[PDB]
DNA sequence: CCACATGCGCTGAA
DNA sequence: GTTCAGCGCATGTG
């Protein structure tokens, strides 16, 4: 029939917001979504990716595949030979083995080359690390010389350069999608970002940059992210694809209240010691009030009203600990609620929870690293493919 | 200079 | 090596 098979390759895959968004819109597009491959080295993300996206996977105690050597328990550092031994002969090893075998996980982007990068990819995503780009962090940036984690962007450059020479034009990925944080468009980062856009044109791609807020895509979260959607020059001509004006999109509001889960056994914060003020609403529809003498870290010092939207969920720190005011008291958004906040489903969260391998704080960590799924649904909805 | 808005962060002690 | 409570300022707009 006219079912189009869509082969997706996810670099820096995390828990697969990209794959989730494609499977969500697939039926409406008459698409069949297929794993071409992925690159993710973070043990908790990989386990969780498998939990969320597997069909009929049955975990068991297994030896770790002998070439699974570049993986990380914290997402920043490679695991030692000893840490690898500790994963060997466990249920967790089976998740890592399954990711390799069934999802074609290549684990470490540095280990990706023209000899293992799949041909004929329809959608190639690269949500590269934001650490050195985020305004919340130290802003070391992405200068090539510095070899930073956000600088792993230049590994994507390497890969494209390599495959350009060995692949036919038609074997090159059809669509590319970058995601990163808003500070990528800062004055200090523009030089590097512009250098990247010029390389993409060098590689035969036509691109558009979008700065999109999750709050405009049916979410109760202020989260501004930069996307660079690219289309291969010739495929643009063959399809007649045109870039949509996604920055003009505004959907109906959603409030924090709309995703909250009722419980009788929540832990409430004792804030009796701290002076406070009326709630105040900013232009963005964040309704918040400060806690005085709480900490010296600004972003930690706010309680949010559930009748507005909330702040960007971060993996760690202040914005991973989102305090909301409810009738029963002030509490943090829970891991379930953080999954819902990134527009994953309750069933997605239950699958990760049921693995019994991911702590509550690690579940928030991987949610905070992710992308709100309906932003991606909106972007992927604009894509065109040539009829079979 | 100011007031305001906002953050897929970092790390050392236990 | 883990883990997370305690910790600040960058990058804006007006
Ligand atoms: N050398 C490397 N190889 C593969 N993955 C890497 C890497 N360095 C960092 N990463 C991963 O890149 C990710 C950036 S966050 C991306 C999250 C993803 N878009 C999602 O849906 O959740 C992190 O999960 C981090 O573990």
Domain boundaries along the sequence of chain A: 1-251+344-388, 252-343
CB-based contacts of A333: which residues, under 8 Å, 6+ apart? Answer: A310, A313, A322, A324, A341
CATH 3.90.120.10 for the A252-343 domain, yes or no: yes
- Sheet architecture: strand order including A205-213: A31-39, A4-11, A123-126, A175-181, A224-232, A205-213
Structure tokens at A346: 């309750």
Angstrom distance, A217 CA to C8 C1': 31
A261's tokens: 């889960």
* Structure's resolution in angstroms: 2.2
In order of A64, A80, A87, A327, A356, the CA distances from A90 in angstroms are 8, 17, 6, 44, 13
Q: Which residue has the tokens 């597009």?
A: A29
CATH of domain A1-251+344-388: 3.40.50.150
User: Distance between CA A40 and CA A105 in Å, rounded?
Assistant: 7
E-assigned strand segments in chain A? 4-11, 31-39, 123-126, 175-181, 205-213, 224-232, 280-281, 287-290, 302-305, 323-326, 329-332
The secondary structure of residue A299, as a DSSP letter, is G
Match 């297929």 to its residue by tokens: A34
Q: Is A130 a catalytic residue?
A: yes
Q: How far apart are CA A113 and CA A224, in angstroms?
A: 32
Q: Which helix (H) or strand (E) holds A334?
A: none
Distance of alpha carbon A9 from alpha carbon A57, whole angstroms? 21
State how far the alpha carbon of A143 is from the alpha carbons of A38, A77, A140, A228, A289, in Å: 25, 20, 8, 19, 38
* Interatomic CA distance for residues A144 and A164, integer angstroms: 21
Asked whether residue A108 is marked as a ligand-binding residue, the answer is yes
Structural method? X-ray
As a whole number of angstroms, the distance between CA A35 and CA A205 comes to: 23
Nucleotides of C under 7 A from a protein CB: 1-12
- Cβ(A102)–Cβ(A59) under 8 Å? no
Q: How many angstroms separate the alpha carbon of residue A280 from the centre of ligand 1?
A: 36
- Measured in residues, chain A has a length of 388
A275: exposed, middle or buried (Cβ count in 10 Å: 0-12, 13-18, 19+) = exposed
CB of A80 lies under 7 Å from some atom of strand C = yes
Check if A1-251+344-388 and A252-343 are the same fold: no
């Amino acid at each position: 029939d006219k079912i189009k098979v869509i082969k997706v390759f996810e670099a820096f895959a995390g828990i697969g917001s990209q794959f989730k968004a494609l499977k969500n819109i697939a039926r409406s597009k008459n698409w069949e979504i297929q794993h071409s491959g992925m690159v993710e080295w973070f043990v908790d993300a990989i386990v969780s990716y498998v939990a969320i996206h597997s069909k009929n996977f049955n975990p068991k105690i297994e030896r770790l595949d002998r070439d699974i050597l570049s993986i990380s328990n914290d997402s920043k550092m490679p695991i030692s030979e000893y840490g690898i031994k500790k994963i060997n002969n466990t249920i967790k090893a089976s998740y890592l083995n399954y990711a390799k075998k069934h999802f074609n996980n290549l684990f470490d982007i540095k280990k990706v080359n023209k000899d293992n990068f799949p041909k004929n990819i329809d959608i190639f995503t690269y949500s590269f690390p934001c650490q050195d780009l985020s305004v919340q962090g130290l802003q070391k940036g992405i200068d090539k010389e510095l070899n930073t984690r956000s600088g792993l962007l230049w590994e994507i450059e390497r890969i494209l350069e390599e495959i350009k020479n060995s692949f036919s034009k038609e074997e090159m990925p059809k669509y590319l999608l970058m995601e990163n944080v808003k500070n990528l468009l800062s004055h200090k980062n523009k030089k590097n970002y512009n250098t990247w856009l010029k390389q993409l044109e060098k590689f035969g791609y036509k691109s558009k940059t979008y700065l999109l807020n999750s709050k405009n895509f049916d979410n109760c979260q202020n989260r501004e992210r930069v996307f660079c959607l690219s289309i291969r020059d010739d495929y643009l001509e063959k399809t007649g694809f045109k870039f949509k004006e996604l920055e003009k999109v505004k959907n109906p509001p959603k409030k924090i209240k709309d995703i909250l889960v009722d419980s009788s056994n929540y832990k409430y914060l004792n804030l009796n010691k701290y002076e406070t003020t009326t709630f105040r609403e900013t232009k963005s529809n964040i309704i918040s009030r400060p806690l005085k003498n709480y900490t010296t870290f600004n972003s930690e010092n706010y309680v949010y009203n559930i009748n507005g939207i909330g702040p960007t969920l971060t993996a760690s720190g202040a914005n991973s600990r989102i305090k909301i005011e409810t009738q029963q008291g002030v509490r943090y958004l829970t891991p379930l609620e953080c999954f819902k906040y990134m527009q994953f489903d309750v069933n997605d969260f239950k699958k990760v929870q049921s693995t019994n391998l991911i702590s509550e704080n690690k579940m928030i960590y991987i949610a905070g690293n992710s992308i709100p799924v309906k932003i991606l649904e909106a972007i992927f909805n604009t894509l065109e493919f040539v009829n079979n």
